Symmetry: C3
Protein backbone atom coordinates (compact mmCIF):
# COMPACT_ATOMS: atom_id res chain seq x y z
CA UNK A 1 0.00 0.00 0.00
CA UNK A 2 0.97 3.63 -0.55
CA UNK A 3 -0.47 7.12 -0.01
CA UNK A 4 -2.86 5.76 2.62
CA UNK A 5 -3.95 7.54 5.80
CA UNK A 6 -7.74 7.38 5.96
CA UNK A 7 -7.82 4.10 7.98
CA UNK A 8 -4.81 5.21 10.06
CA UNK A 9 -4.62 8.45 12.06
CA UNK A 10 -1.98 7.67 14.69
CA UNK A 11 1.84 8.09 15.02
CA UNK A 12 4.25 5.14 14.88
CA UNK A 13 7.85 4.25 15.76
CA UNK A 14 10.73 5.19 13.46
CA UNK A 15 9.07 8.53 12.68
CA UNK A 16 12.43 10.31 12.50
CA UNK A 17 13.98 7.57 10.37
CA UNK A 18 11.08 7.69 7.91
CA UNK A 19 11.41 11.45 7.37
CA UNK A 20 15.22 11.20 7.04
CA UNK A 21 14.86 8.59 4.30
CA UNK A 22 12.18 10.59 2.47
CA UNK A 23 14.32 13.73 2.60
CA UNK A 24 17.17 11.97 0.77
CA UNK A 25 14.85 10.90 -2.10
CA UNK A 26 13.50 14.44 -2.48
CA UNK A 27 16.99 15.89 -3.01
CA UNK A 28 17.99 13.07 -5.37
CA UNK A 29 15.01 13.94 -7.57
CA UNK A 30 16.08 17.58 -7.94
CA UNK A 31 19.51 16.40 -9.07
CA UNK A 32 17.96 14.09 -11.67
CA UNK A 33 15.98 16.92 -13.26
CA UNK A 34 19.06 19.16 -13.38
CA UNK A 35 21.26 16.54 -15.05
CA UNK A 36 18.46 15.61 -17.46
CA UNK A 37 18.15 19.24 -18.56
CA UNK A 38 21.88 19.42 -19.29
CA UNK A 39 21.82 16.23 -21.37
CA UNK A 40 18.85 17.41 -23.45
CA UNK A 41 20.42 20.84 -23.89
CA UNK A 42 23.63 19.26 -25.20
CA UNK A 43 21.76 17.31 -27.89
CA UNK A 44 19.99 20.49 -28.99
CA UNK A 45 23.34 22.26 -29.40
CA UNK A 46 24.71 19.50 -31.62
CA UNK A 47 21.61 19.66 -33.82
CA UNK A 48 21.96 23.43 -34.32
CA UNK A 49 25.66 23.03 -35.14
CA UNK A 50 24.88 20.50 -37.87
CA UNK A 51 22.29 22.80 -39.44
CA UNK A 52 24.85 25.60 -39.35
CA UNK A 53 27.51 23.68 -41.28
CA UNK A 54 24.84 22.51 -43.73
CA UNK A 55 23.89 26.11 -44.51
CA UNK A 56 27.55 26.90 -45.22
CA UNK A 57 27.70 24.29 -48.01
CA UNK A 58 24.39 25.38 -49.55
CA UNK A 59 25.54 29.00 -49.70
CA UNK A 60 28.64 27.95 -51.64
CA UNK A 61 26.51 25.94 -54.08
CA UNK A 62 24.27 28.94 -54.69
CA UNK A 63 27.23 31.07 -55.76
CA UNK A 64 28.44 28.39 -58.18
CA UNK A 65 25.04 28.32 -59.89
CA UNK A 66 24.79 32.12 -59.90
CA UNK A 67 27.91 32.30 -62.08
CA UNK A 68 26.58 29.70 -64.52
CA UNK A 69 23.22 31.48 -64.81
CA UNK A 70 24.89 34.78 -65.70
CA UNK A 71 26.71 33.26 -68.68
CA UNK A 72 23.68 31.14 -69.57
CA UNK A 73 21.65 34.35 -69.86
CA UNK A 74 24.42 36.21 -71.70
CA UNK A 75 24.35 36.30 -75.50
CA UNK B 1 23.71 11.55 7.73
CA UNK B 2 20.77 10.79 5.44
CA UNK B 3 18.43 7.91 4.60
CA UNK B 4 19.24 6.25 7.94
CA UNK B 5 16.81 4.29 10.12
CA UNK B 6 18.46 0.98 10.99
CA UNK B 7 20.05 2.29 14.25
CA UNK B 8 16.92 4.35 15.04
CA UNK B 9 13.40 2.93 15.31
CA UNK B 10 11.62 5.49 17.50
CA UNK B 11 9.53 8.68 16.94
CA UNK B 12 10.85 12.16 17.72
CA UNK B 13 9.59 15.72 18.28
CA UNK B 14 8.75 17.99 15.34
CA UNK B 15 7.25 15.04 13.44
CA UNK B 16 4.54 17.23 11.91
CA UNK B 17 7.02 19.97 10.99
CA UNK B 18 9.32 17.47 9.29
CA UNK B 19 6.55 16.09 7.07
CA UNK B 20 5.29 19.61 6.23
CA UNK B 21 8.76 20.63 5.06
CA UNK B 22 9.23 17.44 3.02
CA UNK B 23 5.84 17.91 1.36
CA UNK B 24 6.87 21.34 0.05
CA UNK B 25 10.04 19.93 -1.58
CA UNK B 26 8.07 17.15 -3.28
CA UNK B 27 5.73 19.61 -5.00
CA UNK B 28 8.60 21.92 -5.97
CA UNK B 29 10.25 18.99 -7.77
CA UNK B 30 7.16 18.31 -9.91
CA UNK B 31 7.16 21.97 -10.97
CA UNK B 32 10.84 21.78 -11.95
CA UNK B 33 10.26 18.82 -14.27
CA UNK B 34 7.29 20.55 -15.91
CA UNK B 35 9.17 23.79 -16.58
CA UNK B 36 12.22 21.86 -17.79
CA UNK B 37 10.08 20.00 -20.33
CA UNK B 38 8.72 23.28 -21.70
CA UNK B 39 12.20 24.79 -22.08
CA UNK B 40 13.53 21.73 -23.91
CA UNK B 41 10.44 21.59 -26.12
CA UNK B 42 10.92 25.23 -27.11
CA UNK B 43 14.50 24.60 -28.27
CA UNK B 44 13.33 21.65 -30.36
CA UNK B 45 10.74 23.84 -32.09
CA UNK B 46 13.35 26.45 -33.04
CA UNK B 47 15.59 23.74 -34.50
CA UNK B 48 12.78 22.37 -36.68
CA UNK B 49 11.91 25.88 -37.87
CA UNK B 50 15.49 26.49 -39.00
CA UNK B 51 15.57 23.24 -40.95
CA UNK B 52 12.28 24.24 -42.57
CA UNK B 53 13.57 27.58 -43.87
CA UNK B 54 16.76 25.87 -45.02
CA UNK B 55 14.77 23.44 -47.16
CA UNK B 56 12.94 26.37 -48.77
CA UNK B 57 16.23 27.85 -50.07
CA UNK B 58 17.52 24.49 -51.33
CA UNK B 59 14.32 23.88 -53.29
CA UNK B 60 14.75 27.22 -55.06
CA UNK B 61 18.35 26.38 -55.93
CA UNK B 62 17.29 23.05 -57.42
CA UNK B 63 14.90 24.78 -59.83
CA UNK B 64 17.61 27.21 -60.96
CA UNK B 65 19.92 24.32 -61.83
CA UNK B 66 17.11 22.37 -63.50
CA UNK B 67 16.69 25.18 -66.04
CA UNK B 68 20.42 25.31 -66.78
CA UNK B 69 20.61 21.54 -67.25
CA UNK B 70 17.78 21.57 -69.80
CA UNK B 71 19.61 24.05 -72.04
CA UNK B 72 22.95 22.36 -71.35
CA UNK B 73 21.48 19.12 -72.69
CA UNK B 74 19.75 20.84 -75.61
CA UNK B 75 21.53 20.96 -78.98
CA UNK C 1 1.10 26.97 5.20
CA UNK C 2 4.02 24.82 4.05
CA UNK C 3 7.63 24.10 5.01
CA UNK C 4 6.97 25.38 8.54
CA UNK C 5 8.46 23.99 11.75
CA UNK C 6 9.90 26.91 13.71
CA UNK C 7 6.67 27.55 15.71
CA UNK C 8 6.02 23.79 16.02
CA UNK C 9 8.47 21.29 17.51
CA UNK C 10 6.20 18.42 18.59
CA UNK C 11 4.91 15.14 17.03
CA UNK C 12 1.29 14.69 15.92
CA UNK C 13 -1.18 11.93 15.03
CA UNK C 14 -1.17 10.31 11.58
CA UNK C 15 2.64 10.42 11.51
CA UNK C 16 2.83 7.10 9.65
CA UNK C 17 0.11 8.11 7.18
CA UNK C 18 1.88 11.39 6.41
CA UNK C 19 5.17 9.68 5.57
CA UNK C 20 3.40 7.01 3.47
CA UNK C 21 1.71 9.70 1.39
CA UNK C 22 4.93 11.68 0.95
CA UNK C 23 6.80 8.54 -0.13
CA UNK C 24 4.35 7.97 -3.00
CA UNK C 25 4.87 11.52 -4.35
CA UNK C 26 8.66 11.13 -4.24
CA UNK C 27 8.57 8.02 -6.45
CA UNK C 28 6.05 9.59 -8.84
CA UNK C 29 8.47 12.48 -9.39
CA UNK C 30 11.31 10.17 -10.42
CA UNK C 31 9.00 8.56 -12.99
CA UNK C 32 8.06 11.97 -14.40
CA UNK C 33 11.70 12.93 -15.01
CA UNK C 34 12.40 9.59 -16.70
CA UNK C 35 9.43 9.84 -19.07
CA UNK C 36 10.21 13.49 -19.80
CA UNK C 37 13.76 12.58 -20.82
CA UNK C 38 12.46 9.96 -23.25
CA UNK C 39 10.02 12.38 -24.87
CA UNK C 40 12.68 15.07 -25.34
CA UNK C 41 15.14 12.49 -26.67
CA UNK C 42 12.61 11.33 -29.26
CA UNK C 43 12.13 14.86 -30.61
CA UNK C 44 15.91 15.28 -30.91
CA UNK C 45 16.14 12.08 -32.97
CA UNK C 46 13.48 13.27 -35.42
CA UNK C 47 15.32 16.57 -35.87
CA UNK C 48 18.60 14.81 -36.69
CA UNK C 49 16.83 12.52 -39.16
CA UNK C 50 15.39 15.49 -41.04
CA UNK C 51 18.80 17.14 -41.30
CA UNK C 52 20.19 13.85 -42.60
CA UNK C 53 17.69 13.55 -45.46
CA UNK C 54 18.21 17.23 -46.26
CA UNK C 55 21.95 16.68 -46.70
CA UNK C 56 21.23 13.82 -49.11
CA UNK C 57 19.32 16.14 -51.48
CA UNK C 58 21.96 18.89 -51.31
CA UNK C 59 24.72 16.43 -52.20
CA UNK C 60 22.81 15.39 -55.32
CA UNK C 61 22.35 19.03 -56.33
CA UNK C 62 26.08 19.67 -55.96
CA UNK C 63 26.90 16.90 -58.44
CA UNK C 64 24.43 18.27 -60.98
CA UNK C 65 26.10 21.69 -60.85
CA UNK C 66 29.58 20.16 -60.96
CA UNK C 67 28.81 18.66 -64.37
CA UNK C 68 27.48 21.96 -65.73
CA UNK C 69 30.53 23.86 -64.48
CA UNK C 70 32.92 21.47 -66.23
CA UNK C 71 31.31 22.10 -69.63
CA UNK C 72 30.87 25.80 -68.85
CA UNK C 73 34.63 26.04 -68.31
CA UNK C 74 35.43 23.88 -71.35
CA UNK C 75 36.20 25.60 -74.66
Amino acid sequence: GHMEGKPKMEPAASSQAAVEELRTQVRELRSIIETMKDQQKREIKQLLSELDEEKKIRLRLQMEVNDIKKALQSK
